[PDB]
Design a protein around this ligand. Structure first.
Ligand SMILES: Cc1cn([C@H]2C[C@H](OP(=O)(O)O)[C@@H](COP(=O)(O)O)O2)c(=O)[nH]c1=O
Ligand SMILES: [Ca+2]
Length: 129
């Protein structure tokens, strides 16, 4: 897998973000994670977390997996990196997202995220308290 440049357009919530990719605006949905909707418990905290992470980054990168790059809603499906730190992984680590939507084509970083989830559960963080 390889990392591609991209620029913040707008934070949306815990696991979606509007980015410019190859000069085009696009909504990206984070692979392998599920944050609560904003109207749910830890929803605002998740939105806030992803927001600080992408807004404070000097460099945002997009990294597609091996399968699907676009979902049925036309959202890009990717691992997003903020100055070298994976947002997907950081949300899980903090117990602000659960590992989810693990599909056969796009699961490269699955073990790494379940590792972070076990560790966040161990600490009873946010979702897991
Ligand atoms: C994370 C992810 C979600 N999706 C689809 C499945 C879900 O369909 P349904 O809407 O039919 O339940 C939806 C959930 O996304 P949200 O969690 O952002 O709503 O997005 C994918 O197709 N691929 C993916 O990698
Ligand atoms: Ca969600």
């Amino acid at each position: 897998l390889h990392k591609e440049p991209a620029t913040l357009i707008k934070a949306i919530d815990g696991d979606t973000v509007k980015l410019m990719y190859k000069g085009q605006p696009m909504t990206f949905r984070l692979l392998l994670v599920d944050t609560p909707e904003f109207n749910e418990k830890y929803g605002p905290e998740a939105s806030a977390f992803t927001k600080k992470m992408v807004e404070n980054a000097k460099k945002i990168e997009v990294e597609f997996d091996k399968g699907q790059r676009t979902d049925k809603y036309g959202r890009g499906l990717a691992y997003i990196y903020a100055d070298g730190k994976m947002v997907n992984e950081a949300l899980v680590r903090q117990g602000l997202a659960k590992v989810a939507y693990v599909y056969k084509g796009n699961n490269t970083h699955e073990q790494l995220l379940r590792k972070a989830e076990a560790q966040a559960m161990k600490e009873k963080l946010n979702i897991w308290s």
